[PDB]
Write an enzyme that holds these catalytic residues in place. Structure first.
Site, mmCIF file in Angstrom:
data_model
loop_
_atom_site.group_PDB
_atom_site.id
_atom_site.type_symbol
_atom_site.label_atom_id
_atom_site.label_comp_id
_atom_site.label_asym_id
_atom_site.label_seq_id
_atom_site.Cartn_x
_atom_site.Cartn_y
_atom_site.Cartn_z
ATOM 1 N N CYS A 132 0.873 -1.163 0.000
ATOM 2 C CA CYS A 132 0.000 0.000 0.000
ATOM 3 C C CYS A 132 0.919 1.224 0.000
ATOM 4 O O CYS A 132 2.057 1.103 0.452
ATOM 5 C CB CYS A 132 -0.902 -0.038 1.242
ATOM 6 N N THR A 133 0.470 2.387 -0.476
ATOM 7 C CA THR A 133 1.324 3.546 -0.761
ATOM 8 C C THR A 133 2.310 3.869 0.369
ATOM 9 O O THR A 133 3.510 3.997 0.108
ATOM 10 C CB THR A 133 0.470 4.782 -1.133
ATOM 11 N N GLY A 134 1.828 3.918 1.614
ATOM 12 C CA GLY A 134 2.617 4.252 2.790
ATOM 13 C C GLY A 134 2.885 3.049 3.695
ATOM 14 O O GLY A 134 3.316 3.250 4.829
ATOM 15 N N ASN A 135 2.642 1.819 3.216
ATOM 16 C CA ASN A 135 2.702 0.529 3.924
ATOM 17 C C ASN A 135 1.702 0.390 5.077
ATOM 18 O O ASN A 135 0.872 -0.518 5.074
ATOM 19 C CB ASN A 135 4.131 0.236 4.424
ATOM 20 N N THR A 136 1.753 1.292 6.052
ATOM 21 C CA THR A 136 1.062 1.203 7.335
ATOM 22 C C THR A 136 -0.464 1.164 7.215
ATOM 23 O O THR A 136 -1.135 0.686 8.131
ATOM 24 C CB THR A 136 1.522 2.389 8.203
ATOM 25 N N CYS A 137 -1.009 1.641 6.091
ATOM 26 C CA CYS A 137 -2.437 1.774 5.845
ATOM 27 C C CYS A 137 -3.199 0.465 6.074
ATOM 28 O O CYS A 137 -4.307 0.503 6.609
ATOM 29 C CB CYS A 137 -2.650 2.259 4.406
ATOM 30 N N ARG A 138 -2.626 -0.682 5.673
ATOM 31 C CA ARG A 138 -3.255 -1.991 5.882
ATOM 32 C C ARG A 138 -2.289 -3.156 5.729
ATOM 33 O O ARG A 138 -2.510 -4.188 6.354
ATOM 34 C CB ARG A 138 -4.418 -2.184 4.885
ATOM 35 N N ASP A 163 -10.124 0.884 3.318
ATOM 36 C CA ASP A 163 -8.876 1.557 3.691
ATOM 37 C C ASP A 163 -9.094 2.377 4.970
ATOM 38 O O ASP A 163 -9.740 3.426 4.901
ATOM 39 C CB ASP A 163 -8.370 2.466 2.563
#
Length: 150
Positions: free
Chosen positions: A7-13, A118
């Site tokens: 995911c774009t920022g990793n931490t999102c999911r 998300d």
């Protein structure tokens, strides 16, 4: 089999999916590795105070520190599991259309492009809604893997 949730920022999911899939693989007796990255993550992002809490409610006790998705990790892995078609095309743009290794988070399971809820920046309730959907998906994902560990 080695899987990169992305995911774009990793931490999102992605680290929620990692923790769930590790737990589900242990339930199923599957044999894999799973890890997480982001196309614009950094080596010092980490599990959010609500993702981590959602998996502590799941009684998995998530703990993760991000890193960018880069070509050596891509080469090391055997599946990439991206939250969106846009992420799939970013990965392709990084790696010279290594796109064949990538499937979208719904797509690998449903057969069609799509994503889970998300929760990024929501309350614990949004991560709670997410981890329910994500678990149901990841049980089907384990069913998909047991074909060939792929």
């Amino acid at each position: 089999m080695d899987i990169i949730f992305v995911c774009t920022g990793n931490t999102c999911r992605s680290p929620m999916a990692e923790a769930l899939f590790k737990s589900i693989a242990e339930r199923e007796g599957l044999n894999v590795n799973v890890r997480s990255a982001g196309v614009f993550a950094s080596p010092n992002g980490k599990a959010t105070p609500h993702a981590v809490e959602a998996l502590f409610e799941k009684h998995i006790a998530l703990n993760h520190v991000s890193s960018p998705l880069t070509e050596e990790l891509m080469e090391s892995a055997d599946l990439v599991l991206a939250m969106t078609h846009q992420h799939k095309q970013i990965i392709a743009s990084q790696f010279g259309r290594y796109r064949d290794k990538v499937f979208t988070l719904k797509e690998y399971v449903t057969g069609s492009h799509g994503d889970v809820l998300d929760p990024f920046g929501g309350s614990i309730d949004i991560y709670k809604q997410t981890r329910d959907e994500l678990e149901e998906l990841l049980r089907q994902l384990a069913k998909q893997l047991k074909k060939d560990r792929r």
